[PDB]
């Protein structure tokens, strides 16, 4: 039972831009529920400006797949209807995964690295369990509660599959071809195996912290490429077993691929022993801020898409 809470724009106070980009413009506010006098800190999106019709779609899925216990994937609080469309979400005070792992590379251990690819994949098969395909998975789409918590985000390009259903077949929008399982590219089709190729490359792109996959070639040479064979490259950081499942997501028999579920047992199973599987120079020395650390606080301080050409 999918309900939208509509929130009064009066209720926010202190609303400033975070960022913009092809999600759209994300803000950051103050959302203070009249009724009580509680200060939550909020996000706050709108589309790239057809704007309405489609974040309505986006605000359905995420009530859609909502639920009591729901650690990995990001909450609907409501939406806001003035001048746009805006969806409210609590803010997520540590950013994108993508632009943390780029900013904070020289204190990023294997054991982050090891349990954010456990979460991704708790959370993925939490939308899995809930007949839901993504479409868009990738690190510009994972957010950072605190360096220990991430949560997966934006589900404008995602769809809920039917009881009878085991796959979507897109139409002509605009798609992210680098994150893409080639029989995406190929026909169009998604599955819950199409988004395990995507996990792949968000593995790699966090293990690169945040290198651009086939920087300087083409999207349309990309299928070519998945064709011949060719993969994106094993990260320095990373040993055989750790390379081997992205190399098994991105299989070209799309069953073949692991499952969610068996990418949250493997990657738990080198989260106890992460030293192991990643190797990187001063792992022990490094640290990132932490709830339980008492200065936490002062933590909290004040073309990817593009027309599809073949399918
Ligand atoms: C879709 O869930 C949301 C809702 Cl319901 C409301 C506001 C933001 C989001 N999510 C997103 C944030 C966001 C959510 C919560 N806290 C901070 C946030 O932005 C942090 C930085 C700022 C710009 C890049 O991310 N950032 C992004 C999304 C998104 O859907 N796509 C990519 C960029």
């Given at each position: 039972?999918?309900?939208?809470?509509?929130?009064?724009?009066?209720?926010?106070?202190?609303?400033?831009?975070?960022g913009?980009?092809?999600?759209?413009?994300?803000?950051?506010?103050?959302?203070?529920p009249e009724?009580?006098?509680?200060?939550?800190?909020?996000?706050?999106?709108?589309?790239?400006?057809?704007?309405?019709?489609?974040?309505?779609?986006?605000?359905?899925?995420?009530?859609?797949?909502?639920?009591?216990?729901?650690?990995?994937?990001?909450?609907?609080?409501?939406?806001?209807?003035?001048?746009?469309?805006?969806?409210?979400?609590?803010?997520?005070?540590?950013?994108?995964?993508?632009?943390?792992?780029?900013?904070?590379?020289?204190?990023?251990?294997?054991?982050?690295?090891?349990?954010?690819?456990?979460?991704?994949?708790k959370?993925?098969?939490?939308?899995?369990?809930?007949?839901?395909?993504?479409?868009?998975?990738?690190?510009?789409?994972?957010?950072?509660?605190?360096?220990?918590?991430?949560?997966?985000?934006?589900?404008?390009?995602?769809?809920?599959?039917?009881?009878?259903?085991?796959?979507?077949?897109?139409?002509?929008?605009?798609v992210?071809?680098?994150?893409?399982?080639?029989?995406?590219?190929?026909?169009?089709?998604?599955?819950?195996?199409?988004?395990?190729?995507?996990?792949?490359?968000?593995?790699?792109?966090?293990?690169?912290?945040?290198?651009?996959?086939?920087?300087?070639?083409?999207?349309?040479?990309?299928?070519?490429?998945?064709?011949?064979?060719?993969?994106?490259?094993?990260?320095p950081?990373?040993?055989?077993?750790?390379?081997?499942?992205?190399?098994?997501?991105?299989?070209?028999?799309?069953?073949?691929?692991?499952?969610?579920?068996?990418?949250?047992?493997?990657?738990?199973?080198?989260?106890?022993?992460?030293?192991?599987?990643?190797?990187?120079?001063?792992?022990?020395?490094?640290?990132?801020?932490?709830?339980?650390?008492?200065?936490?606080?002062?933590?909290?301080?004040?073309?990817?898409?593009?027309?599809?050409?073949?399918?």
């Amino acid at each position: 039972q999918a309900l939208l809470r509509i929130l009064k724009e009066t209720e926010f106070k202190k609303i400033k831009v975070l960022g913009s980009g092809a999600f759209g413009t994300v803000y950051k506010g103050l959302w203070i529920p009249e009724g009580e006098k509680v200060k939550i800190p909020v996000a706050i999106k709108e589309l790239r400006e057809k704007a309405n019709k489609e974040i309505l779609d986006e605000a359905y899925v995420m009530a859609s797949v909502d639920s009591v216990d729901n650690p990995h994937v990001c909450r609907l609080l409501g939406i806001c209807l003035t001048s746009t469309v805006q969806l409210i979400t609590q803010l997520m005070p540590f950013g994108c995964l993508l632009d943390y792992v780029r900013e904070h590379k020289d204190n990023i251990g294997s054991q982050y690295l090891l349990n954010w690819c456990v979460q991704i994949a708790k959370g993925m098969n939490y939308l899995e369990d809930r007949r839901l395909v993504h479409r868009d998975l990738a690190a510009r789409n994972v957010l950072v509660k605190t360096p220990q918590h991430v949560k997966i985000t934006d589900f404008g390009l995602a769809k809920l599959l039917g009881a009878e259903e085991k796959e979507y077949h897109a139409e002509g929008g605009k798609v992210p071809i680098k994150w893409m399982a080639l029989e995406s590219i190929l026909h169009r089709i998604y599955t819950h195996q199409s988004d395990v190729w995507s996990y792949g490359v968000t593995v790699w792109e966090l293990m690169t912290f945040g290198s651009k996959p086939y920087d300087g070639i083409p999207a349309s040479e990309i299928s070519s490429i998945l064709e011949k064979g060719e993969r994106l490259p094993q990260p320095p950081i990373c040993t055989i077993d750790v390379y081997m499942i992205m190399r098994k997501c991105w299989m070209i028999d799309a069953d073949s691929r692991p499952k969610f579920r068996e990418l949250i047992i493997e990657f738990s199973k080198m989260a106890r022993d992460p030293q192991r599987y990643l190797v990187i120079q001063g792992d022990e020395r490094m640290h990132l801020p932490s709830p339980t650390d008492s200065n936490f606080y002062r933590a909290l301080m004040d073309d990817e898409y593009l027309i599809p050409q073949q399918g």
